[PDB]
Design a protein around this ligand. Sequence first.
Ligand code: HEC
Ligand code: HEC
Ligand SMILES: [Zn+2]
Ligand SMILES: [Zn+2]
Lengths: 137, 136
Amino acid sequence: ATKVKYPDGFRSWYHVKSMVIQPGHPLENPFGGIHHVYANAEAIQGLRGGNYPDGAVLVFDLFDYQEDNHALVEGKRKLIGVMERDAKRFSATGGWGYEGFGEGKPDKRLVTDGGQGCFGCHAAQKESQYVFSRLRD
Amino acid sequence: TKVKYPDGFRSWYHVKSMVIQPGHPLENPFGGIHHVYANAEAIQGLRGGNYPDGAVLVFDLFDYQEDNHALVEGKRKLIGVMERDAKRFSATGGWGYEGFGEGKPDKRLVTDGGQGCFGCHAAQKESQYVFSRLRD
Ligand code: HEC
Ligand code: HEC
Ligand SMILES: [Zn+2]
Ligand SMILES: [Zn+2]
């Protein structure tokens, strides 16, 4: 394709982890909100300490939140980030293709530079195949 | 008579999450970052059917650490469990309530047959005693 596929049905995949990024954290833009990480079956193989098969997809699902009496509550989806494994097609950015969908909508693709900008930051995790998230129990 | 420990619950569908911080009314026992998981049968009730027997919902509660204005997940504090069985759990509206300390099967937390859990969940009689709603 050259392009990353919209990950249909990502919401029924394995929930890896969540984190909250609030105002004042260095990454308030653009990663401010509650985010959840999801992984398909092939991605779990790579997360477990296996290698990542082609077809492995990880999803960053980012929500705005609202403060409600000492509770942070999920608001609207801001975007999904998608990493799709293909050693051959996405060799230019380390075997992963990078894409963002605005509000998680399939038409609102965000990345304009082949994912160089995305890769630039993930290149730090060379040791773990460009993935920050770690599996927890 | 007892709620079964929900083996494999971490591979279930993630319904939603929420953060309860110090000061919230529910701070104990429920303070922390929590995620709600549902088995296949519980998804039927969530998308608007009746909840069939065998439906299980799970409240998975982690501590968090605040680090330069990020909330990072720490250790699992407990899980809350609702298990649907109209016959066995008639006394608590057809749901069995149980708490597992640290998410370990040995550490049962409920000592009043679920009455305490049931008293608050009863506000949501209209939606079969469930607070969580499905979101996209
Ligand atoms: C640093 C300045 C980043 C840039 C630019 C991008 N991402 Fe990244 N990403 C970053 C972090 C710190 C994390 C981990 C968050 C956590 O909760 O641990 C992530 C995570 C992802 C993931 C999930 C898988 C993983 O590597 O943990 C995906 C799918 C992802 N990011 C995609 C992505 C895309 C598409 C980006 C450009 C549009 C992008 N990221 C930029 C840090 C940084
Ligand atoms: C009053 C306040 C209570 C009490 C005493 C208990 N819970 Fe229940 N609970 C409450 C709320 C407001 C929520 C919703 C959280 C959210 O929207 O993110 C929940 C949720 C659960 C869930 C998830 C399913 C659901 O949304 O109904 C479970 C499985 C659950 N709670 C279990 C549970 C158990 C076992 C309790 C006694 C040990 C218990 N709860 C008490 C509010 C309240
Ligand atoms: Zn207050
Ligand atoms: Zn803070």
